[PDB]
Design a protein that fits this description.
Helix content is 32%, strand content 21%. By secondary structure, it is an alpha/beta fold. It is found in: Cytoplasm; Nucleus.
Length: 282
């Protein structure tokens, strides 16, 4: 039944046409990994502090994503869905993180996979400090396992060292591009850490989630996280509509959730989360 449902979603996405003119500007061509994967103008992240007389200076391939299915009365985490950095966009990424007050970054790709570049590194090595445009980033600690890396970063503007912000960077290592993890437990545990971290930081800005293209692993993991939050806050019997949730996130960034197997993985992950949650009750 999953194939039929994903086909329907893909058919709808064909008609999901909205202006993407900023991403199409020639001066922004080196800021995109794929000419056809671009942020909608209406929901794109606009970089602040730039000179409006430098064409394209405000551009990054990323969109705000919120759970638009929730009512006014409902608390929920919000996100940015972003492309993975190219060398030319590392500084842009840090301007985005700074201006949005993001305290948690979720990277769902390795830097290079099977010889294909996916995302250049945009952090210093452990115990080191790097400048990225007007910002200093220091890697103050790193916990690596075979499944994920957690880096604790300290970020400050070069012109105000007294303003230091701790940012937690979570990198999942076992989710290949265009594919799915072998089992859902790793992603669920990873998200549990991420959710707890964000919940511990009142006033944190949106969680930045990225992959390589910023749509497949990014879209899938955002949808999983949104549905986990529904289950955690609303309860085990909350209405879960994965197709509707995907359509809603695709209204905000094109092509979110790239493959039928990723679509299925959302169901499998959420089913496991429900079972774990039910067993924790009794």
């Amino acid at each position: 039944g999953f194939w039929e449902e994903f086909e329907s979603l893909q058919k709808q996405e064909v008609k999901n046409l909205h202006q993407r003119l900023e991403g199409q500007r020639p001066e922004n061509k080196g800021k995109n990994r794929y000419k056809n994967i671009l942020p909608f103008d209406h929901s794109r992240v606009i970089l602040q502090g730039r000179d409006s007389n430098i064409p394209g200076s405000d551009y990054i391939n990323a969109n705000y994503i919120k759970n638009q299915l929730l009512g006014p009365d409902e608390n929920a985490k919000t996100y940015i869905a972003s492309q993975g950095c190219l060398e030319a966009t590392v500084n842009d990424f840090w301007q985005m993180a700074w201006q949005e007050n993001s305290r948690v970054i979720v990277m769902t790709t390795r830097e290079v996979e099977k010889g294909r570049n996916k995302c250049v590194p945009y952090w210093p090595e452990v115990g080191m400090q790097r400048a990225y445009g007007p910002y200093s980033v220091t890697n103050c600690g790193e916990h690596d396992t075979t499944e994920y890396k957690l880096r604790t970063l300290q970020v400050s503007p070069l012109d105000n060292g007294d303003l230091i912000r701790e940012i937690w960077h979570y990198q999942y290592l076992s989710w290949p591009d265009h594919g799915v993890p072998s089992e859902p437990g790793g992603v669920l545990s990873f998200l549990d850490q991420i959710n707890q971290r964000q919940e511990s930081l009142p006033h944190a800005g949106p969680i930045i989630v990225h992959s390589s293209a910023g749509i497949g692993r990014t879209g899938t993991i955002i949808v999983i996280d949104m549905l986990m939050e529904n289950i955690s806050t609303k309860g085990l019997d909350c209405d879960i509509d994965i197709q509707k949730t995907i359509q809603m996130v695709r209204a905000q960034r094109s092509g979110m959730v790239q493959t039928e197997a990723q679509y299925k993985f959302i169901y499998v992950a959420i089913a496991q989360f429900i079972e774990t949650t039910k067993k924790k009750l009794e």
